[PDB]
Amino acid sequence: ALLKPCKLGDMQCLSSATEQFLEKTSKGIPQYDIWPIDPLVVTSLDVIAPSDAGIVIRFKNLNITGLKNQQISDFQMDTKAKTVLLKTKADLHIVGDIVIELTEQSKSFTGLYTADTNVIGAVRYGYNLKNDDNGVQHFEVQPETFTCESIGEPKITLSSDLSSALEKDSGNNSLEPDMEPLKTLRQAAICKIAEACYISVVHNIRASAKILPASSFFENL
């Protein structure tokens, strides 16, 4: 029992089912293919700066805490058109290796990246209801669409040496938020990190719905 079954529409039951689920799955369940979500590690993620093609940010081994305590802020399940809209509020703390490539100059900056913010992640997915060969009914959750509805106000830190290197390159005594690469680090990088998190989040729902009878998610249908 990793699932508490809920009546359709009871946000109270859903909220404590969500709490249960994230705790039970926080450090992963490899026999069910459930990825660890808190702490969630992201091997590798690149982001280009939307407003500068010559800045490549490469993240390695990001350590992300705070997903096991996400709160449902919107749930819209249409049992006719067979769709789900889920939105959650998460308090994220993110730490990891960062590589900043200024390709146009053939320069590079290695270091440690830190981010704290609250995000709101929005996922939309279709599903079907379908039986096993053993004759047990399962949800099949189709590939989801993700929106980074809110990135909050991120608090970004870089390593002390990484900072001094950029201060020496740019020519300013401080790191500059109205400029590159902090602008990308505050925004798009956050939007992308949040997407990686909700990919794992939605995969775990998918993965668990392969194993568990659909009646373990909702009682009537």
Ligand X SMILES: CC[C@]1(C)O[C@@H]1CC/C(C)=C/CC/C(C)=C/C(=O)OC
Structure token digits, residue 171: 């020519």
178 assigned ligand-binding residue: no
133 assigned ligand-binding residue: no
Pick 17 or 185: Cβ nearer ligand X: 17
From residue 52, alpha-carbon distances to 66, 75, 127, 160, 183 in Å are 31, 36, 38, 24, 10
DSSP state letter for 174:
S
Ramachandran angles phi, psi of 2, nearest 5°: -95, -10
Pick 184 or 204: Cβ nearer ligand X: 204
Query: Among 88, 89, 87, 79, which Cα is nearest to 126's?
Result: 79
Task: Give me the residues that bind ligand X (CB under 6 A), please.
Answer: 14, 17-18, 21, 84, 86, 127, 139, 141, 201, 205, 209, 217
Pick 14 or 57: Cβ nearer ligand X: 14
93 assigned ligand-binding residue: yes
Least distance between ligand X and beta carbon 63 (Å): 20
132 assigned ligand-binding residue: yes
Pick 152 or 213: Cβ nearer ligand X: 213
For residue 49, the SS3 value is: strand
For the annotated binding site for Zn(2+), the residues are 33, 91, 93, 116, 132, 138, 203
